[PDB]
Nucleic acid binder design. Structure first.
Ligand SMILES: [K+]
Ligand SMILES: [Mg+2]
Ligand SMILES: [Mg+2]
Ligand SMILES: [Mg+2]
Ligand SMILES: [Mg+2]
Ligand SMILES: [Mg+2]
Ligand SMILES: [Mg+2]
Ligand SMILES: [Mg+2]
Ligand SMILES: [Mg+2]
Ligand SMILES: [Mg+2]
Ligand SMILES: [Mg+2]
Ligand SMILES: [Mg+2]
Ligand SMILES: [Mg+2]
Ligand SMILES: [Mg+2]
Ligand SMILES: [Mg+2]
Ligand SMILES: [Mg+2]
Ligand SMILES: [Mg+2]
Ligand SMILES: [Mg+2]
Ligand SMILES: [Mg+2]
Ligand SMILES: [Mg+2]
Ligand SMILES: [Mg+2]
Ligand SMILES: [Mg+2]
Ligand SMILES: [Mg+2]
Ligand SMILES: [Mg+2]
Ligand SMILES: [Mg+2]
Ligand SMILES: [Mg+2]
Ligand SMILES: [Mg+2]
Ligand SMILES: [Mg+2]
Ligand SMILES: [Mg+2]
Ligand SMILES: [Mg+2]
Ligand SMILES: [Mg+2]
Ligand SMILES: [Mg+2]
Ligand SMILES: [Mg+2]
Ligand SMILES: [Mg+2]
Ligand SMILES: [Mg+2]
Ligand SMILES: [Mg+2]
Ligand SMILES: [Mg+2]
Ligand SMILES: [Mg+2]
Ligand SMILES: [Mg+2]
Ligand SMILES: [Mg+2]
Ligand SMILES: [Mg+2]
Ligand SMILES: [Mg+2]
Ligand SMILES: [Mg+2]
Ligand SMILES: [Mg+2]
Ligand SMILES: [Mg+2]
Ligand SMILES: [Mg+2]
Ligand SMILES: [Mg+2]
Ligand SMILES: [Mg+2]
Ligand SMILES: [Mg+2]
Ligand SMILES: [Mg+2]
Ligand SMILES: [Mg+2]
Ligand SMILES: [Mg+2]
Ligand SMILES: [Mg+2]
Ligand SMILES: [Mg+2]
Ligand SMILES: [Mg+2]
Ligand SMILES: [Mg+2]
Ligand SMILES: [Mg+2]
Ligand SMILES: [Mg+2]
Ligand SMILES: [Mg+2]
Ligand SMILES: [Mg+2]
Ligand SMILES: [Mg+2]
Ligand SMILES: [Mg+2]
Ligand SMILES: [Mg+2]
Ligand SMILES: [Mg+2]
Ligand SMILES: [Mg+2]
Ligand SMILES: [Mg+2]
Ligand SMILES: [Mg+2]
Ligand SMILES: [Mg+2]
Ligand SMILES: [Mg+2]
Ligand SMILES: [Mg+2]
Ligand SMILES: [Mg+2]
Ligand SMILES: [Mg+2]
Ligand SMILES: [Mg+2]
Ligand SMILES: [Mg+2]
Ligand SMILES: [Mg+2]
Ligand SMILES: [Mg+2]
Ligand SMILES: [Mg+2]
Ligand SMILES: [Mg+2]
Ligand SMILES: [Mg+2]
Ligand SMILES: [Mg+2]
Ligand SMILES: [Mg+2]
Ligand SMILES: [Mg+2]
Ligand SMILES: [Mg+2]
Ligand SMILES: [Mg+2]
Ligand SMILES: [Mg+2]
Ligand SMILES: [Mg+2]
Ligand SMILES: [Mg+2]
Ligand SMILES: [Mg+2]
Ligand SMILES: [Mg+2]
Ligand SMILES: [Mg+2]
Ligand SMILES: [Mg+2]
Ligand SMILES: [Mg+2]
Ligand SMILES: [Mg+2]
Ligand SMILES: [Mg+2]
Ligand SMILES: [Mg+2]
Ligand SMILES: [Mg+2]
Ligand SMILES: [Mg+2]
Ligand SMILES: [Mg+2]
Ligand SMILES: [Mg+2]
Ligand SMILES: [Mg+2]
Ligand SMILES: [Mg+2]
Ligand SMILES: [Mg+2]
Ligand SMILES: [Mg+2]
Ligand SMILES: [Mg+2]
Ligand SMILES: [Mg+2]
Ligand SMILES: [Mg+2]
Ligand SMILES: [Mg+2]
Ligand SMILES: [Mg+2]
Ligand SMILES: [Mg+2]
Ligand SMILES: [Mg+2]
Ligand SMILES: [Mg+2]
Ligand SMILES: [Mg+2]
Ligand SMILES: [Mg+2]
Ligand SMILES: [Mg+2]
Ligand SMILES: [Mg+2]
Ligand SMILES: [Mg+2]
Ligand SMILES: [Mg+2]
Ligand SMILES: [Mg+2]
Ligand SMILES: [Mg+2]
Ligand SMILES: [Mg+2]
Ligand SMILES: [Mg+2]
Ligand SMILES: [Mg+2]
Ligand SMILES: [Mg+2]
Ligand SMILES: [Mg+2]
Ligand SMILES: [Mg+2]
Ligand SMILES: [Mg+2]
Ligand SMILES: [Mg+2]
Ligand SMILES: [Mg+2]
Ligand SMILES: [Mg+2]
Ligand SMILES: [Mg+2]
Ligand SMILES: [Mg+2]
Ligand SMILES: [Mg+2]
Ligand SMILES: [Mg+2]
Ligand SMILES: [Mg+2]
Ligand SMILES: [Mg+2]
Ligand SMILES: [Mg+2]
Ligand SMILES: [Mg+2]
Ligand SMILES: [Mg+2]
Ligand SMILES: [Mg+2]
Ligand SMILES: [Mg+2]
Ligand SMILES: [Mg+2]
Ligand SMILES: [Mg+2]
Ligand SMILES: [Mg+2]
Ligand SMILES: [Mg+2]
Ligand SMILES: [Mg+2]
Ligand SMILES: [Mg+2]
Ligand SMILES: [Mg+2]
Ligand SMILES: [Mg+2]
Ligand SMILES: [Mg+2]
Ligand SMILES: [Mg+2]
Ligand SMILES: [Mg+2]
Ligand SMILES: [Mg+2]
Ligand SMILES: [Mg+2]
Ligand SMILES: [Mg+2]
Ligand SMILES: [Mg+2]
Ligand SMILES: [Mg+2]
Ligand SMILES: [Mg+2]
Ligand SMILES: [Mg+2]
Ligand SMILES: [Mg+2]
Ligand SMILES: [Mg+2]
Ligand SMILES: [Mg+2]
Ligand SMILES: [Mg+2]
Ligand SMILES: [Mg+2]
Ligand SMILES: [Mg+2]
Ligand SMILES: [Mg+2]
Ligand SMILES: [Mg+2]
Ligand SMILES: [Mg+2]
Ligand SMILES: [Mg+2]
Ligand SMILES: [Mg+2]
Ligand SMILES: [Mg+2]
Ligand SMILES: [Mg+2]
Ligand SMILES: [Mg+2]
Ligand SMILES: [Mg+2]
Ligand SMILES: [Mg+2]
Ligand SMILES: [Mg+2]
Ligand SMILES: [Mg+2]
Ligand SMILES: [Mg+2]
Ligand SMILES: [Mg+2]
Ligand SMILES: [Mg+2]
Ligand SMILES: [Mg+2]
Ligand SMILES: [Mg+2]
Ligand SMILES: [Mg+2]
Ligand SMILES: [Mg+2]
Ligand SMILES: [Mg+2]
Ligand SMILES: [Mg+2]
Ligand SMILES: [Mg+2]
Ligand SMILES: [Mg+2]
Ligand SMILES: [Mg+2]
Ligand SMILES: [Mg+2]
Ligand SMILES: [Mg+2]
Ligand SMILES: [Mg+2]
Ligand SMILES: [Mg+2]
Ligand SMILES: [Mg+2]
Ligand SMILES: [Mg+2]
Ligand SMILES: [Mg+2]
Ligand SMILES: [Mg+2]
Ligand SMILES: [Mg+2]
Ligand SMILES: [Mg+2]
Ligand SMILES: [Mg+2]
Ligand SMILES: [Mg+2]
Ligand SMILES: [Mg+2]
Ligand SMILES: [Mg+2]
Ligand SMILES: [Mg+2]
Ligand SMILES: [Mg+2]
Ligand SMILES: [Mg+2]
Ligand SMILES: [Mg+2]
Ligand SMILES: [Mg+2]
Ligand SMILES: [Mg+2]
Ligand SMILES: [Mg+2]
Ligand SMILES: [Mg+2]
Ligand SMILES: [Mg+2]
Ligand SMILES: [Mg+2]
Ligand SMILES: [Mg+2]
Ligand SMILES: [Mg+2]
Ligand SMILES: [Mg+2]
Ligand SMILES: [Mg+2]
Ligand SMILES: [Mg+2]
Ligand SMILES: [Mg+2]
Ligand SMILES: [Mg+2]
Ligand SMILES: [Mg+2]
Ligand SMILES: [Mg+2]
Length: 249
RNA sequence: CUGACUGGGGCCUGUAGAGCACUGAUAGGGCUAGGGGGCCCACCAGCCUACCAAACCCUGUCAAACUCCGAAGGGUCCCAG
RNA sequence: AAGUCUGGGCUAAGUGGUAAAGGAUGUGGCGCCGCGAAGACAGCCAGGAGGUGGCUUAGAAGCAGCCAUCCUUUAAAGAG
RNA sequence: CCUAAGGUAGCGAAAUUCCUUGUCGGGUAAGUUCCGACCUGCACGAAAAGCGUAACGACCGGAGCGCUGUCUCGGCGAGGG
RNA sequence: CGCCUCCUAAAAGGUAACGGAGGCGCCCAAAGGUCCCCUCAGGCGGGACGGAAAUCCGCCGGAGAGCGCAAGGGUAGAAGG
RNA sequence: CGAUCAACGGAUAAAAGUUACCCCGGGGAUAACAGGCUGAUCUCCCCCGAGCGUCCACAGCGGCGGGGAGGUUUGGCACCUCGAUGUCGGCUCGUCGCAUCCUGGGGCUGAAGAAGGUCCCAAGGGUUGGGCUGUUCGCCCAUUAAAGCGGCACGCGAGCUG
RNA sequence: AGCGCCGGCCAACUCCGUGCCAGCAGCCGCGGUAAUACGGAGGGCGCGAGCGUUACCCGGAUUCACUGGGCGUAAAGGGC
RNA sequence: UGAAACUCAAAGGAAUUGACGGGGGCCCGCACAAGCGGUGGAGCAUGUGGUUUAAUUCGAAGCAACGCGAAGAACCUUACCAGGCCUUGACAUGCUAGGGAACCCGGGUGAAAGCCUGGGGUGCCCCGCGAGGGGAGCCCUAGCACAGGUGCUGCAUGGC
RNA sequence: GGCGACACACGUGCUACAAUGCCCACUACAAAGCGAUGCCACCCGGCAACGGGGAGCUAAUCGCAAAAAGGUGGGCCCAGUUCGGAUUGGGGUCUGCAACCCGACCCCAUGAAGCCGGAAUCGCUAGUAAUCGCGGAUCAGCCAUGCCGCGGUGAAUACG
RNA sequence: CCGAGGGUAGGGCCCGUGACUGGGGCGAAGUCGUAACAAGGUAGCUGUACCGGAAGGUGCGGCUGGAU
RNA sequence: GUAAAAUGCUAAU
RNA sequence: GGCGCGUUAACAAAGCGGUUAUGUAGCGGAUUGCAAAUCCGUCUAGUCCGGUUCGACUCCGGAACGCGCCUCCA
């Protein structure tokens, strides 16, 4: 939560080459805000455009109390300006999306052998006297979920039991790595959506030198300072609105 | 008459045990290179630490391929039964 | 086949006559301090209180976790 | 990077799939078999032919109707012993 | 799978296991013979370039160096230079 | 003088495989089944009491470690049997153990009642029918007071099946 | 005394708010900080115990053409 | 032989003026060619991006932004930043209250600004030799209407 | 205080890398402008920047004024040098209230890069290019090597 | 006898629905190339055939709705 | 019969 | 489990007892209205532990991870 390090995913939205540039503009704005808050940034995955932008940049903000501040940036950011890609001096409206997520654990996986039942029995197929009378085949049952692995690959019960336990764990692991990805997904779609011109959280209107956070109504005119990092005025204005969002019925 | 076995006497040995002098291991303490941290400074060095610890020292130990030591026995020759 | 042989002791579990960590007012024999008619130990008969609690906590206010356990009438009363 | 060149069409958990009773659908009250699909094909593949194909089969799977001493679960009778 | 070294091996010699650890299948014309001469590793201090360590000086230092190559024995009163 | 005759006391100057088409002579000197010894593995029961359980170590639990029992599993060993000890599962027929699935009798409970949990005593009797697969095992359907776990050459082929 | 409408078609316009949001929409389109096109207000236009909408039929549609259409290149001559 | 759902607000024909062509033709320009000196490398000057900064004011952006606005940044310039003052204000008009001033020398205190200060001297008609009483430049405090803004929009504009 | 920051990157220029050159001495020929808290002749002190004197001129009259390349004479001898003049130390001059950030200039010392510049790229067709000095605006002084001007000397080549 | 209808068995047509699968329409931004419109940088288009990630390419024959 | 080195540029009257 | 092979920078991938590998990318410039393509330049390394050697990415020994093969007669 609020106190833990967090990860900011900046993707480009509607706009094409111009969105990937505005996404670069959002990316410098956020690194320079971290330096102001004495935070620490490291990039994890960046997809650049030869024009100078990024289709995607993913970076961490290391420091005590990161998810407390950046969490207000998740949403669709709208830019309206004359693009450096435009030739006929027109104003285009383009969008970039920002997803903010707390850095989690890479927690290690192991088997609780008290919720696991191991069955042994005779195997199938060839072997003569051996296969007839030897308990080589192994079934391992994960008791809470019911999923089972069986193994009679070798002639030895201990070898088949070890190999069976390996597959069971590796299987339970992927079940766990998939539910986590399903939650990581529905959460990202909760913050980013389709990245449409609507769905906007903030407008950066370069002609009017205006930045507007339509969630609260706040607007400054220091669009140069906002783009250079000085976001602290806006954050507080939401932090205030957050407390006045907590008004006991 | 030289035999097994036995009495005396000389010489050879590195085990049991023990030990730490060598080769290694080793707990804690002292002292004390170097590192971590470290208040501070890079104009130049200092200072701090109930951090990790080289060497050295103290107490306490470990070893088939460690021995400053070291039996009981064993081997061999001589003389005698 | 030859002692229901003699003398001293232990065991009550048929232990003897099939086993360990560990547990035990089993029983017998030694020790070592301690308290005792400055009336001890056991029971009984009293008192065993007061500032009333320091953190935590809507009460945890003698009678939760945490922080230390000052003192009065004294023959004594721990904020237990 | 390497090879002489890197498996084409078509087919695929198969007379081939180890993990495997893969997964999804169908059938059943319930289906490790069956049929239809999917394709990370351990280890299909083009005359040791590939994929289909009406008709044929004392070949080998799966299902239904009919009917039953196969069975619930056994009883009685006959004749040769 | 032959050969060498150490241990196991129970203090003479010898002694097994698909027991524990290593090495050999070369080399040297001097790394051989003799005579003569010389003595290490390491530590502290000192010294342009020059450092942990190149060469030079002092003091301490019995052998922990060296002995082509594995290990053991041996060894400066030399087998070392 | 010519040897990785290195399988290094060196068969020839000169040499690889396959047999489920197989064969003879031998061995329980030696493997596969079962027994035996052992019990690492397996199953069961304890000791310790850190900690969980709002509170409270012990209702129910038991970190790190410790001690055993059993002789169902997988092994180790190679002791009777290789002039033969027929090997999976099913069927049929049982019998025994008890570490008890149900039924009977109890103690504790974080037991209001009903219903459970946990441990103790108890082996008299009981412990169903079906779908899948050769299966043992397991899953599933429908019930049940319950749908126990083991030994008997993994009981039982001069009893059947195959 | 109410209901529809006032960008064009189509009769009836100005001010504030909003700022591709909120919304309008029968078609062409409106709205991205000076909107007669969104919402309100004033003002206007049309009907009036009614005003609008939705559905459906004919019309406009000579757009199934008898009245009253077409086929070189727009859809349209059959390969002969 | 020959549909439908769904969907679009058009799909089309010919012709016009353009623009474009790695179409043609005919022309031209230091456009190439033909020449001569350079730039790109070096050191400095200057402008700029970027980084940095409390601030490093802002505008200029291919040719046609970059010794450009700037034909002169130590202060001033100066629009930026830090700290100290200012409240009809540095300036404009007009209206009411205390004054009634105009102007010129000083005093503290402060970095200065500013704040608190202490000396004095007026016009016009007059009632006038009256105490002096008014109209009376201008000046200062109470209030006003107000000013001030290099704050934004060169995509609302003029001018250049 | 900043606008003058400095790991870096680009544009415009200046100065060079040398002998058809550098140096010293002496000796010539311009044009355009500017000049009253203004230009400064001339004289002295100072190596010099400058200072103190101090004529003349609202200026075809007095001054800024040396033009520079050029010429004659002598020197350097092919070297990172008598080429180059960056960087830094020290001692001073002037403006200005005030030169730390952050001015210009003078003298002494220090004497860096640089040996003609990769891919690439700019200008110029005649008094042009190149080379050489001069003045002005702004302006207290100046970071001007910039701008706008002015004359001196004076080419190569254009088939197409 | 016929006979409502009930039952048995086999056909026809229609509607809904189905693991999976085939393309189609739409989209103010994505990935790969650039086939077509200029001789579109290999004139295009065409029926058919074979091939290729994709547009497409190539063979055979046809068309001009092709350039100079 | 001729005779091309060279790909691309989203989205706001 | 046995046996063989391997670990190198951003990626893929080599040689070598003493020593800028290489290609593509990345970075600075050039060219273009801009991007690509193209052109001039530029460069970061040897998994861990222990030995040998004057010297180890390179040789020996072990660890960890990956790949290939085998695991048969009951
Ligand atoms: K066989
Ligand atoms: Mg991406
Ligand atoms: Mg464009
Ligand atoms: Mg178990
Ligand atoms: Mg088996
Ligand atoms: Mg089978
Ligand atoms: Mg077989
Ligand atoms: Mg078979
Ligand atoms: Mg067995
Ligand atoms: Mg004798
Ligand atoms: Mg003798
Ligand atoms: Mg001993
Ligand atoms: Mg020792
Ligand atoms: Mg010992
Ligand atoms: Mg010893
Ligand atoms: Mg002694
Ligand atoms: Mg003796
Ligand atoms: Mg003797
Ligand atoms: Mg004798
Ligand atoms: Mg008696
Ligand atoms: Mg007696
Ligand atoms: Mg008893
Ligand atoms: Mg007994
Ligand atoms: Mg007993
Ligand atoms: Mg006792
Ligand atoms: Mg294959
Ligand atoms: Mg192929
Ligand atoms: Mg094919
Ligand atoms: Mg295929
Ligand atoms: Mg398949
Ligand atoms: Mg299947
Ligand atoms: Mg198949
Ligand atoms: Mg196969
Ligand atoms: Mg399978
Ligand atoms: Mg299988
Ligand atoms: Mg299944
Ligand atoms: Mg199924
Ligand atoms: Mg089903
Ligand atoms: Mg079946
Ligand atoms: Mg199938
Ligand atoms: Mg698969
Ligand atoms: Mg085949
Ligand atoms: Mg094959
Ligand atoms: Mg073939
Ligand atoms: Mg063949
Ligand atoms: Mg073939
Ligand atoms: Mg087939
Ligand atoms: Mg057919
Ligand atoms: Mg068939
Ligand atoms: Mg058929
Ligand atoms: Mg047949
Ligand atoms: Mg047949
Ligand atoms: Mg036949
Ligand atoms: Mg059937
Ligand atoms: Mg049936
Ligand atoms: Mg039937
Ligand atoms: Mg019968
Ligand atoms: Mg009968
Ligand atoms: Mg009969
Ligand atoms: Mg031999
Ligand atoms: Mg040998
Ligand atoms: Mg011995
Ligand atoms: Mg020995
Ligand atoms: Mg001995
Ligand atoms: Mg001997
Ligand atoms: Mg041996
Ligand atoms: Mg031997
Ligand atoms: Mg060897
Ligand atoms: Mg020698
Ligand atoms: Mg020698
Ligand atoms: Mg000699
Ligand atoms: Mg020494
Ligand atoms: Mg020294
Ligand atoms: Mg030294
Ligand atoms: Mg030695
Ligand atoms: Mg040596
Ligand atoms: Mg060696
Ligand atoms: Mg050999
Ligand atoms: Mg041999
Ligand atoms: Mg041989
Ligand atoms: Mg021998
Ligand atoms: Mg021979
Ligand atoms: Mg021969
Ligand atoms: Mg041979
Ligand atoms: Mg043979
Ligand atoms: Mg065969
Ligand atoms: Mg066969
Ligand atoms: Mg035969
Ligand atoms: Mg055969
Ligand atoms: Mg035969
Ligand atoms: Mg035989
Ligand atoms: Mg025989
Ligand atoms: Mg033998
Ligand atoms: Mg025997
Ligand atoms: Mg056996
Ligand atoms: Mg065995
Ligand atoms: Mg056996
Ligand atoms: Mg066996
Ligand atoms: Mg048996
Ligand atoms: Mg056995
Ligand atoms: Mg037996
Ligand atoms: Mg046991
Ligand atoms: Mg036992
Ligand atoms: Mg055990
Ligand atoms: Mg027990
Ligand atoms: Mg607790
Ligand atoms: Mg309790
Ligand atoms: Mg446990
Ligand atoms: Mg134990
Ligand atoms: Mg035991
Ligand atoms: Mg047994
Ligand atoms: Mg058994
Ligand atoms: Mg056994
Ligand atoms: Mg035996
Ligand atoms: Mg034996
Ligand atoms: Mg046998
Ligand atoms: Mg017999
Ligand atoms: Mg017999
Ligand atoms: Mg027999
Ligand atoms: Mg028999
Ligand atoms: Mg039984
Ligand atoms: Mg019991
Ligand atoms: Mg009961
Ligand atoms: Mg009971
Ligand atoms: Mg009850
Ligand atoms: Mg109970
Ligand atoms: Mg019973
Ligand atoms: Mg059942
Ligand atoms: Mg059935
Ligand atoms: Mg069945
Ligand atoms: Mg079954
Ligand atoms: Mg099974
Ligand atoms: Mg019950
Ligand atoms: Mg039940
Ligand atoms: Mg059984
Ligand atoms: Mg059996
Ligand atoms: Mg049987
Ligand atoms: Mg039989
Ligand atoms: Mg049987
Ligand atoms: Mg039998
Ligand atoms: Mg029999
Ligand atoms: Mg029998
Ligand atoms: Mg059979
Ligand atoms: Mg059969
Ligand atoms: Mg209307
Ligand atoms: Mg109307
Ligand atoms: Mg109208
Ligand atoms: Mg107004
Ligand atoms: Mg409306
Ligand atoms: Mg309408
Ligand atoms: Mg907007
Ligand atoms: Mg507005
Ligand atoms: Mg507008
Ligand atoms: Mg409006
Ligand atoms: Mg509207
Ligand atoms: Mg309307
Ligand atoms: Mg309106
Ligand atoms: Mg009409
Ligand atoms: Mg009509
Ligand atoms: Mg109609
Ligand atoms: Mg008609
Ligand atoms: Mg018509
Ligand atoms: Mg015709
Ligand atoms: Mg036609
Ligand atoms: Mg036809
Ligand atoms: Mg047309
Ligand atoms: Mg044209
Ligand atoms: Mg040229
Ligand atoms: Mg040049
Ligand atoms: Mg240059
Ligand atoms: Mg330059
Ligand atoms: Mg800047
Ligand atoms: Mg502006
Ligand atoms: Mg320019
Ligand atoms: Mg300026
Ligand atoms: Mg300037
Ligand atoms: Mg200023
Ligand atoms: Mg100022
Ligand atoms: Mg304009
Ligand atoms: Mg602008
Ligand atoms: Mg204008
Ligand atoms: Mg500036
Ligand atoms: Mg440069
Ligand atoms: Mg310049
Ligand atoms: Mg330059
Ligand atoms: Mg002058
Ligand atoms: Mg020099
Ligand atoms: Mg040089
Ligand atoms: Mg020089
Ligand atoms: Mg100086
Ligand atoms: Mg300055
Ligand atoms: Mg030179
Ligand atoms: Mg010209
Ligand atoms: Mg000048
Ligand atoms: Mg000036
Ligand atoms: Mg009928
Ligand atoms: Mg009918
Ligand atoms: Mg194309
Ligand atoms: Mg084409
Ligand atoms: Mg093109
Ligand atoms: Mg092309
Ligand atoms: Mg083409
Ligand atoms: Mg074709
Ligand atoms: Mg082709
Ligand atoms: Mg061509
Ligand atoms: Mg290309
Ligand atoms: Mg593209
Ligand atoms: Mg495109
Ligand atoms: Mg192009
Ligand atoms: Mg466009
Ligand atoms: Mg390598
Ligand atoms: Mg790699
Ligand atoms: Mg290579
Ligand atoms: Mg580059
Ligand atoms: Mg570029
Ligand atoms: Mg490279
Ligand atoms: Mg080394
Ligand atoms: Mg090493
Ligand atoms: Mg190296
Ligand atoms: Mg290695
Ligand atoms: Mg075989």
């Amino acid at each position: 939560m609020d106190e833990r390090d967090a990860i900011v995913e900046i993707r480009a939205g509607t706009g094409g080459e111009e969105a990937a540039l505005f996404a670069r503009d959002l990316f410098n704005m956020y690194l320079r805000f971290a330096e102001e808050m004495g935070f620490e940034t490291e990039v994890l995955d960046s997809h650049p455009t030869d024009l100078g932008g990024f289709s995607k940049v993913v970076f961490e903000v290391r420091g005590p109390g990161a998810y407390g501040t950046f969490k207000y940036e998740s949403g669709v950011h709208r830019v309206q300006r004359v693009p450096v890609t435009e030739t006929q001096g027109r104003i285009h409206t383009s969008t970039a999306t920002v997803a903010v997520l707390p850095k989690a654990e890479e927690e290690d996986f192991a088997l609780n052998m008290d919720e696991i039942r191991i069955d042994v029995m005779r195997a199938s197929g060839p072997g003569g006297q051996g296969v007839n009378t030897t308990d080589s085949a192994v079934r391992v049952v994960h008791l809470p979920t019911g999923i089972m692995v069986t193994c009679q690959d070798s002639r030895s019960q201990i070898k088949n039991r070890e190999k069976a336990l390996m597959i069971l764990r590796s299987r339970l692991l992927e079940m766990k790595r998939a539910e986590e990805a399903e939650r990581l997904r529905k959460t990202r779609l909760a913050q980013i959506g389709t990245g449409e011109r609507s769905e906007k959280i903030r407008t950066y209107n370069f002609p009017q030198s205006r930045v507007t956070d339509h969630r609260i109504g706040f607007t400054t005119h220091d669009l140069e300072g906002v783009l250079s990092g000085h976001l602290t005025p806006i954050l507080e204005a939401l932090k205030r609105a957050d407390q006045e969002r907590q008004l006991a019925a």
